[PDB]
Write a protein that binds this ligand. Structure first.
Ligand SMILES: CC/C(=C(\c1ccc(O)cc1)c1ccc(OCCN(C)C)cc1)c1ccccc1
Ligand SMILES: CC/C(=C(\c1ccc(O)cc1)c1ccc(OCCN(C)C)cc1)c1ccccc1
Lengths: 246, 246
């Protein structure tokens, strides 16, 4: 039961579920000018998605939900989740975005990546904010978890009895993550006021991540494929797994 | 000095700055089928904007900022501010959106308003959430203020000394509003844990309001005018006021 976990149990659970940092797929020995930035990012995102699924399934309370709800939450939050991870790893690289350990781009270079005319600078600003706030890994994982659960909680299908139970559960887990964040801050020696203030500062950044995701999706949709299986179905295929590999 | 205000002083200040509820402009005696929903909403929004300016100038700390920064914050947050007001007044009208006291539309009716294919339902969901949470007016005004100050704090021009001072001031005011929200909750008899949890629940709703604003702007831009003075300049004209009427 995810609702019985203690703060320390929540943090350890989340830290343990952290996905790996992937590398971009390209010939390091071959010219950089040849590669396509969007092709590289698209390929990176596609590989990260599989791992994101694995991660989501390990976020306490997520698997307690229905398959359809798990799919909806991920379809809503996937890009925000990729972006917050990106901002996090770019924290110690002022002026640059570490898309991957072998793919670090600066402002000027960004000016040439399609669909990033506005968001590159927004992402840098967010990374800078995390740096000023001295965001901790324990805090980062709670935030990423909040995004996954909060993403599409208010865009759910209907109001069936099961749907009401689902929403309630999500809000209870979210409440548990808030408690965890406060605990982490209390442990760090922050005063009560400093605790409330930091919690708020952190949650307000999530509105900026949503903004960046919306702007990114606007571009991705403006170059949408044709007869390509919908994200929903791909997520479903990956989420709707059997236990034959148990 | 807005930074010296007490919680009770902050709330009274915000409540006092509340803008009036405007009416839609149309012949109540004439057929409804004749009017254009987007024309009505556009005309309503335009009139609300002037009053929003007046309101912003009365949000503690806002006028301490530069004119250019005041304009940037409003250009980023204006639609979120209109939307949160809309959700707030539709709170006691399940299944309907009270665009104005003389303009209440239900789901089915929304299905016919351009640009609202997705956001109508999202707005209803938000109103429903506020209802379940039993959101208070004192809380609502703090939230609207947070939107105004948080909106474009991370999309500011450069990093000049003045810009760094500006950002710091905004974050200090935001911190003061957080304290105010916690105070309001403590006064309502909520426990410390219930306080942190509610603060988080309220701030997470702001990410959904940002989402709705982005979707709305997507449509508005898809029907953008030509030789029409940019929003920035209109906001500037309204904000850059003289004191000859003092
Ligand atoms: C911010 C970089 C980025 C992507 C990205 C972000 C973080 C990360 O870890 C990896 C990639 C990005 C780019 C493309 C993309 O494609 C997904 C859609 N495919 C399935 C067609 C996803 C993310 C992007 C998104 C929208 C527009 C421009 C760039
Ligand atoms: C949600 C209703 C709405 C508007 C609205 C919201 C709250 C409120 O109090 C009043 C209106 C809306 C519609 C049009 C609009 O136009 C502004 C641009 N003009 C200057 C060209 C602004 C808001 C809207 C926005 C985008 C798409 C579809 C509808």
């Amino acid at each position: 039961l995810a609702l019985s976990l203690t703060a320390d149990q929540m943090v350890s659970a989340l830290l343990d579920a952290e996905p790996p940092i992937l590398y971009s797929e390209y010939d390091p020995t071959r010219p950089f000018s040849e590669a396509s930035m969007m092709g590289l990012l698209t390929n990176l995102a596609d590989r990260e998605l599989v791992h994101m699924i694995n991660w989501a399934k390990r976020v306490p309370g997520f698997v307690d939900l229905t398959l359809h709800d798990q799919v909806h939450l991920l379809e809503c939050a996937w890009l925000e989740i990729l972006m917050i991870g990106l901002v996090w790893r770019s924290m110690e690289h002022p002026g640059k975005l570490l898309f991957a350990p072998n793919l670090l781009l600066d402002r000027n270079q960004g000016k040439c990546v399609e669909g990033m005319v506005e968001i590159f600078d927004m992402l840098l600003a967010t990374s800078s904010r995390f740096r000023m706030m001295n965001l901790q890994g324990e805090e980062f994982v709670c935030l990423k978890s909040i995004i996954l659960l909060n993403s599409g909680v208010y865009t759910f299908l209907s109001s069936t009895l099961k749907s009401l139970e689902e929403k309630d559960h999500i809000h209870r887990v979210l409440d548990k993550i808030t408690d965890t964040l406060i605990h982490l801050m209390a442990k760090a020696g922050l005063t009560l006021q400093q605790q409330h203030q930091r919690l708020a500062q952190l949650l307000l950044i999530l509105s900026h991540i949503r903004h960046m995701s919306n702007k990114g999706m606007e571009h991705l949709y403006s170059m949408k494929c044709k007869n390509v299986v919908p994200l929903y179905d791909l997520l479903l295929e990956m989420l709707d797994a059997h236990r034959l590999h148990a």
